[PDB]
Design a binder for this molecule. Structure first.
Ligand SMILES: *[C@@H]1O[C@H](CO)[C@@H](O[C@@H]2O[C@H](CO)[C@@H](O)[C@H](O)[C@H]2NC(C)=O)[C@H](O)[C@H]1NC(C)=O
Lengths: 49, 271, 755, 76, 384
């Protein structure tokens, strides 16, 4: 899960950079299941990619 | 570009949403203005000034000798937040050309100083995003299913009958109640029943005529329909507005199986 | 990669089962503890079960946790939980794996008192009801009656107090649909277990004597297409030869064992005499086909022969008929398939092969010659062809046996087995090509067992002794191998087996405990840490355990007689090794004669109980993972293997005159002797009972008892007579006295009949 | 839980140690496997009168003298 | 009952109670008429007993807002019981039919004074009942595009006007049954049928089919129109998981609701309502699942029309579902002789055993009001 914050003003003209992550992630245990499944194409050759 | 991928459309629309949030978060309009007509650009955490030709140094601060043109300025400010939904439920937002304001005949800020959008809300309790592809729905009439379960396919109902509960497949031992069209009555056992071999125990039943509809002939007036539906031998009056006749009787009746009616035209009499 | 673990579990968790989950860790020294737990999926929020297990050198770092998914703690509702998380947690690791769960917990053995019924009868029916453990289930149960049109007719439900569910007697509806009715039994509420049984409703009459038609073969080949030979015999249901019957033979063409009505014959329509219980008949199929039909040759005859026979007793009023619904004409009379054959090689160790020769009517051919061509590759496609061995089938099983002392380098065997009956050409000699593959270890590290592929089953309570040999580059690391013993889906025993200083490993000296008596399975494994990389090494084997019950309930008529008189007072003693319930039933053997093509109610009960085995084949596999999958196990390990590649495929490798009475249930407190009077029906009665105990079900030996008399009358009254019609009613009196004597029967009838 | 020998456990056999440190229980009940004597449909006298009889045990029954008792003299 | 779908409104029902400010453009009407439809959806009952997952809509607060909307809708009524959005604007037969629909819903809890309704019906029919097509719209300056919708005005918008007026009359008639209104209904239905025989554009076909579904559910050409609509239905999956209808290259992507999505959602909602009139749950289910996606998220143009028809369809589905829930104590008895049997027909005990009818008497079968549908057969067996 993602935790995110906003730039209130950018740095410029050599001021200190923001110097910290704008987004953090934390491992969850998910509540729902993945409804994404492979949509394997009907007829085109499926590359191993 | 996002095309021909699993959930292509859902990802596309998510990506549009994200792009709008991303622009709103990281648009360079929020920079302090560059000197000497530097166009600001923002790489997430820092504004960097693109210097005009004839301006140089790290961020354009020293001009060249020929630059002249001092304080000839002007560039867009940021968008306002959206207005609330107006009388026509349209929200709107504006940007003020004020960053920097136009000066000394420098350019007015480019493009539309306002945006307007019709309001919208998600109404239903969506449990989550569906994986929607580009074209998976496009089949209106698929291949006939294999029917591996070997039940009963839908029987053709008898004349003037219909299925209360039309389905592709009926279960073994399932019985289907036929019923008779608007003018008709069921006589006999109105249930077929699906046998284990896929036959239908086809009922000793047939729809008998109760009534006859108002006759389907092309008209505008020249008619007096006492009813939408008529018993056999009930009058239907085809009265001309001016006593002429176009075809057939100026009044008839459903004699039985039919009126034996004129098939070529209505009584659109001459007048 | 020294510190490694295996947790091994059933491939599927049965709902409410007690499942035994066993953990081994390697290369630890400090005594440490782990918990194994079952948790809701995907959220891991709810623990269905947990077990603390201490692991130490004292335990050789092995333990098991016993864990159960109580059926009420599952959320249930519209969606059954399909999957669940098995979890392990320790000071040193945590991992979780998504097990599937299944509600198919237990067995529902429907017993109806008879295989067939007439209209105006009632079907007394009861169900035996057991957990996945053989204990009585004590679960409330619903019968669903289904007619021959597939309509549901009744639901009746009962509370099980015993493991025996005596449902109310179902009266046949006042107008039945004819044919095969069906009963489906389900536990209420919370399990998918579904019993099923059938009965046919017909206007039958009890046959007076059995007619048996006895073709020499259910096929006709080159040898018999010229002429075939076919015995017929008949016996009265008191097991004495039918002295005299007029036999009329009615051949026909056939094309389909399932159903057809191809052209009946009108030539060689032999009428003949049955004497002393037997008639011998022959059929020059070539002559009859060429004379009657436009067919003239077996090449036109990848088809079947129909025969019906009717026989009239030459001095009496009872006449009976039977049929063979097809004898297969085919140029290839046999078919061939492998049995109990792993298709996985133990190189250098002898590779036995067993192959079964089977009829085109799915029946064992018996004695037939066979030769096995064999081709081997050891290494780098170095290819060598072995000399073709030859054998003959076992005369009863139709199973030929072979063994190949394959090279110690062999990596694959491709071998072609062909029937070697010289009288058939190769295009008609049943022949097959097969491939068998080595274990495909990564580190040339293997595990083999000395199991001699014993054709005889193991005898309960004997100490089995199987020698096991790991081989590896790293044998001096291995130190011990583990073993698991599987019965049904369940790990019933586990342990470990140390390397002697001899660099020889303890054999599996174990009693085959009574819970193994349904044919069971063994798997052995170790992890070796290699140079730095661990590999899980494992092997498995099938073990048949000879089907001896736990109760072994022995029931016998104490006044032993060749035959009792009708109405004879009898004393039936039931004895058991322990307190047991018993269900009893009596059915006339003539009722089994009523059904044209009969079967018994509880035939094959044990092979049905064995359906709970999740594994298949004789054992082995393409890999450790495949060995575990085919054993019906799964595992969690960090030792560089996982099951997930392999599909859950359905593996299918092959390894007063009553008609019934005594329909009763009783407690047998180890022994009880029950006396009763037999009916007046002079027939053999097939008496059967079923012991039910905590040890499990045991169908007793069936008791056949003859009711016989030196003189009697029987009358061939049909099932029903048309009102208001004069009829001819025929009977015969039977004399078994040494001598003739004057008899009369005075008939007496109600005024509703005139004669 | 499990009932004493000769009893069937009715309802949910399990309980759970809740976070309250107390047992949540399945409202369970124990019913004797031995059948009670059937209700005296008209006061019919069971000669082997006992409070309980096993399934398949026999009860031997007659009405008062001179009444033709309806149904069998036993239910099992 | 078979399959049941939990298609429901979100907590956004609370926003649709507090909905976008009442005021000019009849933003009040746009706010309140959803309040009414939400009212009736909640009136299906679940959303007060079970809604505790979300904030319960206060009964009294909903009632208050209802009352306020009733007064508002009255305020816009024309003096002659027509209606206009502009005080001085023209009578609109369309908007008046929309009023009649909404005021047909309201009576389920708060009847509108039927006199005013009857006068509005008389005005609308008497002024504008043409005899070949009907209710051609008066010179109202424009339809308020978010309040109304764009039919295919390029061809015979009289088809649209007739459909909408019919539907409004249907919703009113039960509170103002009038024989001449019945006759004008018959006329309009006839014209709408005969002029729907050419398929035109599928929105017209779906709205006409829904109008006829309110009328003769079983006329042969009605069914033929239905069989055409069911041909035009797109589906995903060989067993349809979703079913819906598109036109006019709406297959183009659109990240936001628009007039093309408005037309899509409207035509699909009319087909849904028609199928619910047919009570064809096995056909309706994949349509309800499709509609629950909110593909074109926000839906339609987010027009009043699409939203109202969508909620109407969802309410009618949940209604028909709970109607089919089987509960029926069918007691069968002889006419002269006593009772025979009393089947406690339930989702569990759904199938009582066959009973032989012993006694030689007429048989009367009966049930309590119960719920759902059942069928019962007697067979009689005899000799000749
Ligand atoms: C067939 O035999 C039985 C057995 O004897 C007859 O039934 C008996 O009838 C007498 C009176 O005639 C009674 O006293 C007996 O108690 C009956 N026996 C029973 C009930 O077991 C029967 O009447 C005979 N039917 C005939 C000759 O048509």
């Amino acid at each position: 899960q993602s935790k995110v914050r906003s730039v209130l003003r950018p740095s410029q003209f050599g001021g200190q950079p923001c110097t910290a992550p704008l987004v953090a992630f934390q491992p969850c245990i998910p509540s729902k299941l993945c409804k994404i499944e492979e949509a394997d194409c009907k007829n085109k050759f499926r590359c191993d990619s | 570009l996002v095309r021909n991928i699993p959930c292509a459309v859902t990802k596309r629309n998510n990506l549009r949403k994200a792009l709008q949030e991303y622009a709103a978060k990281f648009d360079p309009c929020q920079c302090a203005p560059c000197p000497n007509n530097g166009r600001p650009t923002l790489s997430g955490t820092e504004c960097l000034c693109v210097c005009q030709s004839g301006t140089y140094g790290e961020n354009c601060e020293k001009q060249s000798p020929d630059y002249k043109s001092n304080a000839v300025d002007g560039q867009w400010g940021c968008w306002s937040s959206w207005s609330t939904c107006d009388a026509t439920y349209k929200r709107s937002r504006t940007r003020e050309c004020n960053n920097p304001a136009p000066q000394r005949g420098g350019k007015r800020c480019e493009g539309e100083k306002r945006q307007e959008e019709d309001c919208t809300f998600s109404i239903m309790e969506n449990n989550g995003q569906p994986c929607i592809n580009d074209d998976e729905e496009m089949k209106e009439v698929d291949l006939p299913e294999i029917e591996a379960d070997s039940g009963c396919p839908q029987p053709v109902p008898p004349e003037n009958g219909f299925i209360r509960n039309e389905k592709q497949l009926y279960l073994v031992g399932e019985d289907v109640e036929i019923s008779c069209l608007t003018g008709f009555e069921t006589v006999g056992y109105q249930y077929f029943r699906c046998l284990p071999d896929g036959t239908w125990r086809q009922g000793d039943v047939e729809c008998q005529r109760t009534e006859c509809i108002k006759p389907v002939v092309q008209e505008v007036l020249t008619i007096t329909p006492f009813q939408r539906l008529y018993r056999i031998g009930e009058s239907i009056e085809l009265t001309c507005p001016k006593g002429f006749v176009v075809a057939g009787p100026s009044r008839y009746t459903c004699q039985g199986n039919s009126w034996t009616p004129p098939i070529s035209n209505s009584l659109t009499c001459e007048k | 990669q020294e510190q490694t673990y295996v947790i091994s579990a059933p491939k599927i968790f049965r709902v409410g089962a007690s499942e035994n989950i066993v953990i081994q860790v390697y290369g630890y020294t400090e005594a440490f503890d782990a918990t194994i737990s079952i948790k809701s999926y995907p959220d891991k929020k709810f623990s269905y079960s947990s077990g603390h297990v201490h692991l130490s050198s004292e335990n050789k770092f092995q333990n098991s946790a016993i864990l159960t998914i109580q059926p009420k703690q599952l959320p249930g509702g519209q969606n059954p939980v399909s999957y669940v998380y098995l979890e392990v947690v320790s000071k040193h690791f945590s991992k979780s794996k998504r097990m599937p769960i299944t509600y198919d917990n237990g067995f529902l053995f429907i017993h109806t008192d008879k295989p067939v019924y007439t209209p105006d009868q009632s079907v007394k029916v009861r169900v035996y009801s057991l957990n996945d453990d053989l204990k009585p289930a004590k679960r409330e149960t619903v019968l669903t009656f289904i007619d021959p049109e597939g309509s549901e007719v009744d639901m009746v439900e009962e509370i099980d107090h015993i493991g025996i569910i005596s449902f109310p007697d179902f009266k046949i509806p006042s107008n039945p649909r004819y044919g095969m009715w069906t009963i489906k039994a389900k536990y209420k509420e919370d399990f998918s277990t579904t019993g099923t049984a059938y009965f046919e409703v017909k206007e039958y009459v009890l046959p007076h004597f059995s007619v048996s038609i006895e073709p020499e073969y259910n096929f006709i080949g080159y040898k018999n297409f010229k002429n075939f030979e076919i015995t017929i015999k008949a016996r009265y249901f008191y097991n004495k030869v039918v002295t005299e019957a007029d036999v009329y033979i009615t051949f026909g063409i056939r094309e389909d064992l399932k159903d057809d009505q191809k052209e009946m014959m009108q030539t060689a329509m032999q009428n003949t005499m049955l004497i002393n219980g037997i008639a011998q008949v022959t059929f020059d199929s070539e002559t009859a086909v060429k004379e009657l039909s436009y067919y003239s040759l077996e090449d036109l005859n990848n088809k079947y022969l129909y025969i019906a026979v009717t026989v009239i007793e030459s001095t009496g009023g009872f006449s009976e008929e039977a049929e063979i619904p097809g004898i297969k004409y085919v140029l290839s009379p046999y078919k061939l398939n492998l049995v109990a054959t792993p298709l996985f090689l133990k190189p250098g160790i002898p590779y036995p092969i067993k192959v079964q020769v089977k009829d085109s009517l799915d029946q064992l051919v018996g004695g037939v010659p066979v030769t096995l061509n064999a081709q081997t590759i050891d290494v780098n496609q170095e290819t060598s062809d072995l000399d073709p061995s030859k054998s003959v089938t076992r005369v009863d099983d139709g199973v030929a046996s072979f063994v190949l002392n394959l090279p110690s380098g062999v990596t694959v065997l491709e071998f072609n087995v062909k029937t070697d009956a010289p009288d058939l050409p190769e295009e008609n000699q049943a022949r097959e090509g097969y491939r068998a593959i080595a274990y495909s270890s990564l580190s040339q590290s293997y595990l083999y067992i000395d199991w001699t592929d014993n054709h005889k089953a193991l005898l309960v309570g004997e100490h089995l002794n199987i020698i096991v040999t790991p081989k590896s580059p790293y044998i001096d690391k291995i130190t011990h191998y583990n073993y698991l013993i599987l019965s049904k889906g369940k790990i019933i025993h586990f342990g470990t087996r140390e390397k002697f200083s001899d660099a020889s490993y303890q054999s599996i000296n174990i009693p085959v405990t009574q819970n193994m008596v349904p044919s069971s399975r063994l798997l052995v494994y170790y992890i070796v840490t290699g140079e730095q990389t661990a590999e899980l090494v494992s092997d498995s084997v099938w073990l048949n355990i000879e089907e001896k019950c736990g109760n072994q309930l022995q029931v016998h008529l104490s006044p032993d007689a060749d035959a009792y008189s009708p109405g004879q007072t009898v004393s039936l003693n039931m004895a058991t090794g322990m307190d047991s319930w018993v269900a009893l039933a009596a059915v006339d053997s003539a009722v089994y004669g009523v059904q044209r093509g009969a079967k018994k109610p509880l035939e094959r009960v044990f092979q049905f109980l064995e359906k709970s085995d999740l594994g298949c084949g004789a054992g082995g596999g393409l890999n450790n993972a495949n060995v575990f999958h085919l054993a019906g196990l799964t595992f969690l390990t960090n030792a560089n293997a996982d099951d997930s590649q392999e599909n859950d495929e359905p593996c299918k490798e092959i390894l007063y005159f009553p008609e019934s009475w005594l329909w009763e249930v009783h407690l047998v407190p180890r022994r009880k002797q029950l006396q009763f009077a037999l009916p007046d029906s002079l027939t053999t009665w097939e008496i059967q009972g079923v012991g039910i105990s905590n040890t499990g079900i045991c169908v007793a030996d069936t008791v056949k008892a003859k009711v016989f008399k030196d003189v009697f009358l029987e009358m061939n009254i049909p099932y029903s007579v048309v009102r208001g019609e004069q009829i001819q009613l025929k009977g015969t009196v039977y004399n078994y006295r040494t001598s003739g004597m004057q008899f009369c029967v005075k008939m007496s009838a109600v005024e509703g009949i005139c004669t | 839980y499990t009932c004493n020998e000769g009893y069937s456990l009715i309802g949910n056999p399990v309980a759970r140690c809740g976070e309250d440190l107390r047992w949540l229980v399945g409202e369970m009940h124990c019913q004797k496997i031995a059948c009670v004597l059937p209700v005296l449909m008209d006061g019919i006298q069971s000669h082997p009168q006992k409070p309980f009889y096993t399934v398949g045990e026999k009860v031997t029954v007659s009405c008062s003298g001179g009444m033709s008792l309806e149904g069998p003299s036993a239910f099992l | 009952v078979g399959e049941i779908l939990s298609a429901v409104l979100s907590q956004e029902g609370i926003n649709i109670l507090t909905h976008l400010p009442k005021g000019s453009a009849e933003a009040e009407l746009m706010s309140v008429v959803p309040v009414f439809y939400v009212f009736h959806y909640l009136e299906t009952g679940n959303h007060w007993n079970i809604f505790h997952s979300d904030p319960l809509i206060e009964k009294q607060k909903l009632k208050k807002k209802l009352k306020e909307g009733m007064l508002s809708i009255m305020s816009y009524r024309n003096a002659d019981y027509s209606y206009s959005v502009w005080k001085g604007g023209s009578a609109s037969t369309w908007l008046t039919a929309f009023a009649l629909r909404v005021l047909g819903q309201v009576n389920k809890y708060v009847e509108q004074n039927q006199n005013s309704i009857c006068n509005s019906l008389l005005w609308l029919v008497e002024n504008y009942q043409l005899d070949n097509g009907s209710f051609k719209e008066n010179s109202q300056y424009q339809p308020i595009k978010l309040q109304g919708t764009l039919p295919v005005e390029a061809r015979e918008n009289s088809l649209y006007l007739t459909a909408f007026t019919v539907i409004g009359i249907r919703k009113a008639f039960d509170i103002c049954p009038l024989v001449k209104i019945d006759t004008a209904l018959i006329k309009a239905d006839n014209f709408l049928l005969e002029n729907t025989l050419p398929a035109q554009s599928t929105f017209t076909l779906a709205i006409s089919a829904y109008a006829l579904s309110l009328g003769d559910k079983t006329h042969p050409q009605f069914r033929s129109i239905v069989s055409a609509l069911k041909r035009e239905a797109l589906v995903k999956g060989n067993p349809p998981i979703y079913r819906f209808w598109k036109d006019n290259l709406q297959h183009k992507d659109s990240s936001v609701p628009n007039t093309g999505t408005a037309r899509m959602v409207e035509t699909t909602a009319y087909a849904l309502l028609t199928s619910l009139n047919l009570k064809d749950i096995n056909y309706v289910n994949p349509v309800i699942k499709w509609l629950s996606e909110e593909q074109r998220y926000g839906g339609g143009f987010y027009s009043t029309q699409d939203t109202i028809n969508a909620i109407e369809g969802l309410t009618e589905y949940s209604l028909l579902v709970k109607q089919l829930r089987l509960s029926m104590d069918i007691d069968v008895s002889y006419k002269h002789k006593g009772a025979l049997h009393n089947y406690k027909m339930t989702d569990k005990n759904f199938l009582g055993r066959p009973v032989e009818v012993l006694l030689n008497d007429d048989l009367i079968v009966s049930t309590g009001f119960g719920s759902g549908l059942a069928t019962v057969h007697v067979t009689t067996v005899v000799h000749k």
